From Swiss-Prot, chain A:
Function: Mitochondrial membrane ATP synthase (F(1)F(o) ATP synthase) produces ATP from ADP in the presence of a proton gradient across the membrane which is generated by electron transport complexes of the respiratory chain. F-type ATPases consist of two structural domains, F(1) - containing the extramembraneous catalytic core, and F(o) - containing the membrane proton channel, linked together by a central stalk and a peripheral stalk. During catalysis, ATP synthesis in the catalytic domain of F(1) is coupled via a rotary mechanism of the central stalk subunits to proton translocation.
Name of the protein described by the UniProt record: ATP synthase subunit beta, mitochondrial
Family membership noted in the UniProt record: Belongs to the ATPase alpha/beta chains family.
Keywords assigned: ATP synthesis, ATP-binding, CF(1), Hydrogen ion transport, Ion transport, Membrane, Mitochondrion, Mitochondrion inner membrane, Nucleotide-binding, Transit peptide, Translocase, Transport
Intracellular or extracellular location(s): Mitochondrion; Mitochondrion inner membrane
UniProtKB/Swiss-Prot annotation, chain D:
Subcellular location: Mitochondrion; Mitochondrion inner membrane
Species: Trypanosoma brucei brucei
Acyltransferase keyword on record: no
Family in the record: Belongs to the ATPase alpha/beta chains family.
Phenotype of null mutants: RNAi-mediated knockdown of the protein in procyclic, insect stage cells impairs assembly of the F(1) component and slows the proliferation rate of procyclic cells that are cultivated in vitro, both in the presence and in the absence of glucose in the growth medium. ATP synthesis by oxidative phosphorylation is dramatically reduced in procyclic cells.
Location (main, coarse): mitochondrion
Range of the intact protein held here: 446 to 584 of 584
Highest classification ranks of the organism: Eukaryota, Discoba, Euglenozoa, Kinetoplastea, Metakinetoplastina
Function: Mitochondrial membrane ATP synthase (F(1)F(o) ATP synthase) produces ATP from ADP in the presence of a proton gradient across the membrane which is generated by electron transport complexes of the respiratory chain. F-type ATPases consist of two structural domains, F(1) - containing the extramembraneous catalytic core, and F(o) - containing the membrane proton channel, linked together by a central stalk and a peripheral stalk. During catalysis, ATP synthesis in the catalytic domain of F(1) is coupled via a rotary mechanism of the central stalk subunits to proton translocation.
Binding residues for ATP: Q19
Protein name per Swiss-Prot or TrEMBL: ATP synthase subunit alpha, mitochondrial
A GO cellular component entry from the record: mitochondrial inner membrane
Record keywords, A-Z: ATP synthesis, ATP-binding, CF(1), Hydrogen ion transport, Ion transport, Membrane, Mitochondrion, Mitochondrion inner membrane, Nucleotide-binding, Transit peptide, Transport
An MF annotation (GO) of this entry: ADP binding
Subunit structure: F-type ATPases have 2 components, F(1) - the catalytic core - and F(o) - the membrane proton channel. F(1) has five subunits: alpha(3), beta(3), gamma(1), delta(1), epsilon(1), plus the additional subunit P18 (Tb427.05.1710) that is not present in F(1)F(o) ATP synthase from metazoa. Subunit P18 (Tb927.5.1710) interacts with the alpha subunit with a 1:1 stoichiometry; the interaction is direct. Subunit gamma is part of the central stalk. F(o) has three main subunits: a, b and c.
Length: 123, 300, 146, 139
């Protein structure tokens, strides 16, 4: 039942994201409501999170592959829909497997940003 | 086959139509976004104009006792596809037709529509290019022509469209009484408790010299005209976006109905041909037969 | 797609797309060196200041002529369009290589500058009944010449 | 958006038509009668399925001790043939039918819909959606 509910919620959010794309084009992003602007952020994370690096391309692409378990995927999407991962950057969901990979990528992105800012302050 | 391609040509035309209408949607989108600033910045210029002219009078006594030309200045769009705005305005004008009615419509749709329907009542119109922003000079041009159409006019009315929201466009009215009637009412408000909210305003204007009052009357009348045209433009672009979407969907439904008839036609065309060939193959086989078999039947 | 009315605006992608769609017009096959060079010039924006009508004439001068040598301004040592044997060097070494990239840009820059200075300037100043016809015939001939 | 009486009842009827398993005759007809008579006008569209479930698989009046009907209690499946026989508009079964419907509507609006309209927590929202999914799939 949890799998079905999550899947339907994802589909509904994606469908709503399409209509909001049209609306923001009509007037603009700021014209949407708080509710709708939170839904345009989660949807973009979902679209990025549905991509995955395949182990078959560990050679010609260079990125380690992932094999996400069924239960892990359900939990990851369920948490994302609720809004638990509303602080993680959008790009942390791009070409990753599972939720732990998202956290690891976010930490690496945060560390890289901190180092770059620290280097800039020196010069 | 021509019949199949007839549908294909028909569907080919609808495809180009969708693209062109799509282009219109984008053009109007930019002008809608540019004109969306008025929504924020409206509703404050016309504050003392209300006191000058805001008079919730009856709709019968105003027109029944007309002894001088009643000039109407309906606002109409140059280009069609706007929606029901022009149609409603015509209904609003048709409902107030009278002996003394004179028409000075705005927009090509206004001139053409009101010239034929009410010949004697139409004198001439004003056409403005939608190239620059609706400015004061355009409003002054409307008023000057209106006066010269009928200087001894009991009232000058402006019938335009108010853009309440993206999907709400009402029909609004600005009635402007000529100088003589306005100063008479301005005189009663100052001298009496009646028109209380206008008591201080009436006395304030009464103190100053006449030429200033005449300038004040013309100035605020121009502002009311400026507001109407500005709102009518914003209602126009908003309406066109709604209408254009309707045309897109109608042209999409046709594309889905002519495609089926095209895919249904090719299937029938293939079947009919093969049946027809295979009915002329059966006939040839049936009419033909094998002759007496000349072989050593005994040798078996 | 939005150019059907609306007074299409000439962004750099459009300023270069039109030239590309005009270079593809040809009658006879093009030698690899001539074709690759012309595409590279239009790709880096050397034709942004060249009107779409004169693109073929610009290509013809680049291939069958050499403005730099004509005006005694060429400084490249080996990279000249009249050296038809550079084709295999370009095939082995891409135009985006230090061996050829430096001289290639120099020649294109010099050719573009000379063309705008001398030829296109006169073209925009044509006002006559016979000069216009001569220009039109010249452009058509260059259209099917390269 | 002008919502007249026909529009409201029609939307409720459409929501009720959403089914997964066949419904017993008594349960279906009773729910249709309640919607037809306007008892669901105050009930939101998204909560109709939950309202119907409480009426068939639950009894609010008995739960909150405000029920006095003698026979017309929905847990009595034997009433189906009695309803099939006379009608739902017969004086024999009309008075009790109205009474239980009014009590069920009053209790539902007082207790359940009021709380459902006061849910903002993300966790509670998820729980509410899961509840609605279950009700829609089960009567
Ligand atoms: O010939 C005249 C007479 C009067 N006025 C004008 O009529 C008005 C009558 O105004 P008031 O009598 O109420 O006051 P005021 O003269 O002190 O006012 P100000 O000049 O400070 O505005 C004043 O503004 C005066 O200048 C003229 O402009 N011309």
């Amino acid at each position: 039942v949890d799998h079905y509910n999550v899947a339907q919620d994802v589909v509904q959010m994606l469908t709503k994201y399409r209509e909001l794309q049209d609306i923001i084009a009509v007037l603009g992003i700021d014209e949407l409501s708080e509710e709708d602007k939170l839904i345009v952020d989660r949807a973009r994370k979902l679209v990025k999170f549905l991509s995955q690096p395949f182990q078959v391309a560990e050679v010609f692409t260079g990125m380690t592959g992932h094999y996400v378990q069924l239960d892990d995927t359900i939990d990851s999407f369920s948490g994302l829909l609720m809004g638990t991962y509303d602080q993680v950057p959008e790009m942390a969901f791009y070409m990753v497997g599972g939720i732990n990979s998202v956290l690891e990528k976010a930490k690496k992105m945060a560390e890289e940003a901190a180092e770059l800012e620290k280097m800039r302050r020196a010069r | 086959s021509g019949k199949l391609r007839l549908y294909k040509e028909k569907l080919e035309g609808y495809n180009r139509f969708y693209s062109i209408v799509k282009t219109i949607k984008m053009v109007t989108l930019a002008k809608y976004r540019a004109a969306q600033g008025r929504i924020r910045t409206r509703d404050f210029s016309l504050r003392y104009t209300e006191l000058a002219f805001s008079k919730p009078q009856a709709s019968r006594d105003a027109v029944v006792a007309a002894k001088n030309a009643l000039v109407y200045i309906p606002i109409t769009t140059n280009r069609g596809s706007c929606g029901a705005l022009n149609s409603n305005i015509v209904r609003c004008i048709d409902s107030v037709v009278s002996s003394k009615m004179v028409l000075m419509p705005v927009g090509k749709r206004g001139i053409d529509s009101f010239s034929k329907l009410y010949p004697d009542e139409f004198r001439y119109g004003i056409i403005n290019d939608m190239k620059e922003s609706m400015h004061f000079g355009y409003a002054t041009f409307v008023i000057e022509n209106a006066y010269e159409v009928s200087k001894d006019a009991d009232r000058y009315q402006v019938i335009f469209n108010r853009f309440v929201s993206a999907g709400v466009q009402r029909n609004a009215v600005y009635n402007i009484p000529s100088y003589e009637k306005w100063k008479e009412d301005l005189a009663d408000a100052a001298s009496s408790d009646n028109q209380k909210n206008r008591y201080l305003f009436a006395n304030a204007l009464q103190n100053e010299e006449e030429q200033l009052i005449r300038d004040f009357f013309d100035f605020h009348a121009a502002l009311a005209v400026l507001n109407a045209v500005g709102e009518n433009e914003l209602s126009e672009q908003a309406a066109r976006l709604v209408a254009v979407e309707g045309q897109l969907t109608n042209i999409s439904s046709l594309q889905q109905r002519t495609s089926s008839l095209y895919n249904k036609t090719r299937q029938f065309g293939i079947t009919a041909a093969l049946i027809e060939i295979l009915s002329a193959m059966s006939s040839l086989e049936g009419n033909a037969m094998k002759g007496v078999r000349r072989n050593k039947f005994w040798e078996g | 797609a939005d150019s059907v009315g609306g007074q299409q605006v000439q962004t750099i992608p459009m300023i270069r797309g039109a030239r590309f769609v005009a270079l593809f017009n040809q009658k006879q096959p093009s030698y690899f060196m001539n074709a690759i060079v012309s595409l590279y010039a239009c790709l880096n924006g050397y034709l942004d200041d060249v009107k779409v009508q004169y693109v073929k004439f610009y290509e013809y001068l680049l291939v069958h002529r050499d403005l730099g040598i004509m005006y005694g301004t060429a400084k490249n040592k080996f990279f000249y369009m009249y050296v038809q044997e550079l084709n295999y060097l370009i095939r082995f070494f891409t135009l985006n290589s230090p061996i050829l990239h430096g001289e290639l840009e120099e020649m294109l820059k010099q050719h573009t500058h000379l063309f705008l200075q001398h030829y296109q300037s006169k073209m925009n100043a044509i006002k006559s009944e016979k000069d216009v016809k001569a220009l039109k015939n010249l452009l058509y001939s260059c259209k099917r010449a390269v």
